[PDB]
Design an enzyme around this catalytic site. Structure first.
Site, PDB file in Angstrom:
ATOM      1  NE  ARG A 196      -3.666   0.082   2.524  1.00 28.34           N
ATOM      2  CZ  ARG A 196      -4.129  -0.557   3.594  1.00 28.34           C
ATOM      3  NH1 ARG A 196      -3.660  -0.310   4.811  1.00 28.34           N
ATOM      4  NH2 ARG A 196      -5.088  -1.470   3.440  1.00 28.34           N
ATOM      5  CG  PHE A 237      -1.653  10.343   2.947  1.00 26.81           C
ATOM      6  CD1 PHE A 237      -2.130  11.057   4.030  1.00 26.81           C
ATOM      7  CD2 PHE A 237      -2.194  10.590   1.705  1.00 26.81           C
ATOM      8  CE1 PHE A 237      -3.147  11.995   3.885  1.00 26.81           C
ATOM      9  CE2 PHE A 237      -3.207  11.530   1.543  1.00 26.81           C
ATOM     10  CZ  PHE A 237      -3.687  12.231   2.635  1.00 26.81           C
ATOM     11  CD  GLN A 239      -0.236  -0.497   5.874  1.00 25.60           C
ATOM     12  OE1 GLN A 239      -0.884   0.507   5.601  1.00 25.60           O
ATOM     13  NE2 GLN A 239      -0.779  -1.553   6.468  1.00 25.60           N
ATOM     14  CG  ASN A 280      -2.852  -0.381  14.957  1.00 22.46           C
ATOM     15  OD1 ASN A 280      -4.014  -0.151  14.605  1.00 22.46           O
ATOM     16  ND2 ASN A 280      -2.078   0.539  15.527  1.00 22.46           N
ATOM     17  CG  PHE A 308       2.716   3.547   8.557  1.00 17.65           C
ATOM     18  CD1 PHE A 308       2.276   2.867   9.691  1.00 17.65           C
ATOM     19  CD2 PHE A 308       2.674   4.943   8.551  1.00 17.65           C
ATOM     20  CE1 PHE A 308       1.824   3.567  10.805  1.00 17.65           C
ATOM     21  CE2 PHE A 308       2.226   5.645   9.660  1.00 17.65           C
ATOM     22  CZ  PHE A 308       1.789   4.955  10.783  1.00 17.65           C
ATOM     23  CG  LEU A 324      -1.968   8.105  11.230  1.00 21.70           C
ATOM     24  CD1 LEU A 324      -0.961   7.549  10.231  1.00 21.70           C
ATOM     25  CD2 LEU A 324      -3.254   7.296  11.203  1.00 21.70           C
ATOM     26  CG  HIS A 367      -0.928   3.792  13.681  1.00 26.21           C
ATOM     27  ND1 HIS A 367      -1.119   2.566  13.084  1.00 26.21           N
ATOM     28  CD2 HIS A 367      -2.072   4.489  13.489  1.00 26.21           C
ATOM     29  CE1 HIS A 367      -2.327   2.523  12.550  1.00 26.21           C
ATOM     30  NE2 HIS A 367      -2.920   3.684  12.770  1.00 26.21           N
TER      31      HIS A 367
HETATM   32  C1  LIG Z   1     -11.317   7.786   3.908  1.00 29.37           C
HETATM   33  C2  LIG Z   1     -10.165   7.388   3.026  1.00 29.37           C
HETATM   34  N1  LIG Z   1      -8.979   7.046   3.824  1.00 29.37           N
HETATM   35  C3  LIG Z   1      -7.867   7.847   4.105  1.00 29.37           C
HETATM   36  C4  LIG Z   1      -7.675   9.219   3.617  1.00 29.37           C
HETATM   37  C5  LIG Z   1      -7.623  10.244   4.552  1.00 29.37           C
HETATM   38  C6  LIG Z   1      -7.383  11.543   4.139  1.00 29.37           C
HETATM   39  N2  LIG Z   1      -7.363  12.568   5.057  1.00 29.37           N
HETATM   40  C7  LIG Z   1      -7.328  12.300   6.501  1.00 29.37           C
HETATM   41  C8  LIG Z   1      -6.535  13.333   7.265  1.00 29.37           C
HETATM   42  N3  LIG Z   1      -7.021  14.674   6.960  1.00 29.37           N
HETATM   43  C9  LIG Z   1      -6.347  15.669   7.792  1.00 29.37           C
HETATM   44  C10 LIG Z   1      -6.763  14.929   5.545  1.00 29.37           C
HETATM   45  C11 LIG Z   1      -7.547  13.974   4.674  1.00 29.37           C
HETATM   46  C12 LIG Z   1      -7.254  11.795   2.778  1.00 29.37           C
HETATM   47  N4  LIG Z   1      -7.290  10.813   1.860  1.00 29.37           N
HETATM   48  C13 LIG Z   1      -7.493   9.543   2.249  1.00 29.37           C
HETATM   49  C14 LIG Z   1      -7.506   8.491   1.155  1.00 29.37           C
HETATM   50  C15 LIG Z   1      -6.332   8.651   0.211  1.00 29.37           C
HETATM   51  O1  LIG Z   1      -8.712   8.595   0.397  1.00 29.37           O
HETATM   52  C16 LIG Z   1      -8.943   7.489  -0.463  1.00 29.37           C
HETATM   53  C17 LIG Z   1      -7.008   7.154   4.951  1.00 29.37           C
HETATM   54  C18 LIG Z   1      -7.609   5.881   5.200  1.00 29.37           C
HETATM   55  C19 LIG Z   1      -7.222   4.773   5.950  1.00 29.37           C
HETATM   56  C20 LIG Z   1      -8.046   3.650   5.985  1.00 29.37           C
HETATM   57  C21 LIG Z   1      -9.248   3.648   5.275  1.00 29.37           C
HETATM   58  C22 LIG Z   1      -9.659   4.727   4.519  1.00 29.37           C
HETATM   59  C23 LIG Z   1      -8.829   5.844   4.492  1.00 29.37           C
HETATM   60  C24 LIG Z   1      -7.639   2.447   6.728  1.00 29.37           C
HETATM   61  C25 LIG Z   1      -8.012   1.173   6.462  1.00 29.37           C
HETATM   62  S1  LIG Z   1      -7.038   0.067   7.329  1.00 29.37           S
HETATM   63  C26 LIG Z   1      -6.275   1.399   8.126  1.00 29.37           C
HETATM   64  N5  LIG Z   1      -6.681   2.575   7.731  1.00 29.37           N
HETATM   65  C27 LIG Z   1      -5.225   1.207   9.175  1.00 29.37           C
HETATM   66  C28 LIG Z   1      -4.119   0.264   8.681  1.00 29.37           C
HETATM   67  N6  LIG Z   1      -4.348  -1.101   9.123  1.00 29.37           N
HETATM   68  C29 LIG Z   1      -4.062  -2.153   8.345  1.00 29.37           C
HETATM   69  O2  LIG Z   1      -3.646  -2.028   7.193  1.00 29.37           O
HETATM   70  C30 LIG Z   1      -4.273  -3.479   8.959  1.00 29.37           C
HETATM   71  C31 LIG Z   1      -4.730  -4.585   8.041  1.00 29.37           C
HETATM   72  C32 LIG Z   1      -3.343  -4.623   8.577  1.00 29.37           C
HETATM   73  C33 LIG Z   1      -2.917  -5.647   9.599  1.00 29.37           C
HETATM   74  C34 LIG Z   1      -2.797   0.774   9.214  1.00 29.37           C
HETATM   75  O3  LIG Z   1      -2.301   0.373  10.260  1.00 29.37           O
HETATM   76  N7  LIG Z   1      -2.174   1.746   8.477  1.00 29.37           N
HETATM   77  C35 LIG Z   1      -0.927   2.410   8.882  1.00 29.37           C
HETATM   78  C36 LIG Z   1      -1.178   3.901   8.972  1.00 29.37           C
HETATM   79  C37 LIG Z   1      -1.783   4.406   7.668  1.00 29.37           C
HETATM   80  C38 LIG Z   1      -3.030   3.598   7.280  1.00 29.37           C
HETATM   81  N8  LIG Z   1      -2.747   2.160   7.257  1.00 29.37           N
HETATM   82  C39 LIG Z   1      -3.476   3.996   5.898  1.00 29.37           C
HETATM   83  O4  LIG Z   1      -3.354   3.304   4.920  1.00 29.37           O
HETATM   84  O5  LIG Z   1      -3.967   5.236   5.890  1.00 29.37           O
HETATM   85  C40 LIG Z   1      -4.242   5.811   4.580  1.00 29.37           C
HETATM   86  C41 LIG Z   1      -4.433   7.313   4.744  1.00 29.37           C
HETATM   87  C42 LIG Z   1      -4.488   7.953   3.357  1.00 29.37           C
HETATM   88  C43 LIG Z   1      -3.240   7.887   5.513  1.00 29.37           C
HETATM   89  C44 LIG Z   1      -5.715   7.645   5.533  1.00 29.37           C
END
Ligand SMILES: CCn1c(-c2cc(N3CCN(C)CC3)cnc2[C@H](C)OC)c2c3cc(ccc31)-c1csc(n1)C[C@H](NC(=O)[C@H]1C[C@@H]1C)C(=O)N1CCC[C@H](N1)C(=O)OCC(C)(C)C2
Ligand SMILES: Nc1nc2c(ncn2[C@@H]2O[C@H](COP(=O)(O)OP(=O)(O)NP(=O)(O)O)[C@@H](O)[C@H]2O)c(=O)[nH]1
Ligand SMILES: [Mg+2]
Lengths: 169, 163
Positions: free
Chosen positions: B53, B58, B61, B100, B111, B120, B124
């Protein structure tokens, strides 16, 4: 061929992706795989007419609830999913419906209420409660199991029928 | 504090080496997990796994060496372990932090931030940072996308501990 923009919404873990992947890929995986966002396209025949479904599978994450508005503006109909063994997810339905209504500025948005995980024996949301909620919204209620495929096509096709009726007016 | 390296490859072609300082002085259990997974000394670890990912703006991962699809991985302590502390914050590019599934579910997935991700903080466990090769992490971003799916296979071709 008519295109329909469907969006699958609801609390985390209710089975939005499992439902969508069953429709698109005809299989089920029993894994924790939370969604970021995914788009899928599928051609189907509903009531004898070719339909092209564009399906947006969304994340159920309250901490990112502000990110929902943009896809609610674009979507034409909403599959509002809860899990029959998760009473909180059933309460969360109303938050999603209210958000859709406010973003789209309308009480008439095509929607279907989906109670998923009906293969599980321990149910905490009774069918009477779900039927009465859907009746209070004026929308259909469909019980599904993404695991067995029960009701999966019915849920998506019923939503297309709701959009088709909306466009007739 | 120990240092570890990843040699990154793109569809099997070398891209370059990223090294990390692991903050064993502040998060010893979490640093040790990443260190041992980087050496493979428990019989399993990061070598050969991919970044599943990559979301430009951002983070990058990875760390799923069991299922190779973003759902797996395991720690050296068992499948999952508790959040050690939340002392350190996601302050900017280069921060290394644990993925997590909610509270107290650290495994092997991690990540690398490519921007400040303050929402976060407290969710995290931050446990290290890029030491050398941030240019490599920046170069990895073009193989990602809005939802994180990668357009080429971004792999940890080799990894280990540095002197
Ligand atoms: C709404 C759309 N969206 C968005 C999002 C958020 C924003 N903003 C939020 C902050 N403001 C200030 C500005 C706008 C803008 N654009 C988008 C995206 C690009 O729009 C498509 C996120 C996100 C995360 C999850 C689901 C939907 C999500 C999610 C789904 S599982 C998860 N988090 C946590 C993830 N666990 C796992 O993988 C588990 C399965 C394994 C064991 C996890 O530990 N990590 C590490 C930390 C990062 C996280 N993954 C991740 O990937 O974060 C993506 C990010 C883009 C950073 C946030
Ligand atoms: N027994 C059973 N389990 C199901 C069913 N649908 C989904 N699951 C399981 O419930 C969990 C969550 O499913 P998933 O489809 O990923 O949920 P989601 O609504 O897409 N979650 P997110 O909002 O984080 O993307 C998974 O373990 C999945 O296998 C179902 O009909 N029956
Ligand atoms: Mg999902």
């Amino acid at each position: 061929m008519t295109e329909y923009k469907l969006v699958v919404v609801g609390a985390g873990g209710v089975g939005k992706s499992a439902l969508t992947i069953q429709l698109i890929q005809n299989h089920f995986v029993d894994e924790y795989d939370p969604t970021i966002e995914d788009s899928y396209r599928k051609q189907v025949v509903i009531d004898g007419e070719t339909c092209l479904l564009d399906i947006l599978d969304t994340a159920g994450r309250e901490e990112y609830s502000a990110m929902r508005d943009q896809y609610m503006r674009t979507g034409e109909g909403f599959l509002c999913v809860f899990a029959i063994n998760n009473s909180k997810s059933f309460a969360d339905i109303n938050l999603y419906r209210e958000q859709i209504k406010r973003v789209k500025d309308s009480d008439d948005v095509p929607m279907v209420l989906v109670g998923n995980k009906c293969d599980l024996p321990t149910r905490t949301v009774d069918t009477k409660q779900a039927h009465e909620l859907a009746k209070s919204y004026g929308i259909p209620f469909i019980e599904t199991s993404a695991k067995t495929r029960q009701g999966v096509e019915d849920a998506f096709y019923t939503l297309v029928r709701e959009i088709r009726q909306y466009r007739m007016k | 504090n120990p240092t570890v390296f990843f040699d990154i490859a793109v569809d099997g072609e070398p891209l370059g080496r990223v090294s990390f300082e692991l903050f064993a002085d502040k998060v010893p259990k979490t640093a040790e997990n990443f260190r041992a997974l980087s050496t493979g000394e428990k019989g399993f670890g990061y070598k050969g796994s991919c970044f599943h990912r990559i979301i430009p703006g951002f983070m990058c991962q990875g760390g799923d060496f069991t299922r190779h699809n973003g759902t797996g991985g395991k720690s050296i302590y068992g499948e999952k372990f508790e959040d050690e502390n939340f002392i350190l914050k996601h302050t900017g590019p280069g921060i290394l932090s644990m993925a997590n599934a909610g509270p107290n579910t650290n495994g092997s997935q991690f990540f690398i931030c490519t921007a400040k991700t303050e929402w976060l903080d407290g969710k995290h466990v931050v446990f290290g940072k890029v030491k050398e090769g941030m240019n490599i992490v920046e170069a990895m971003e073009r193989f990602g996308s809005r939802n994180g799916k990668t357009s080429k296979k971004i792999t940890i071709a080799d990894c280990g501990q540095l002197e």
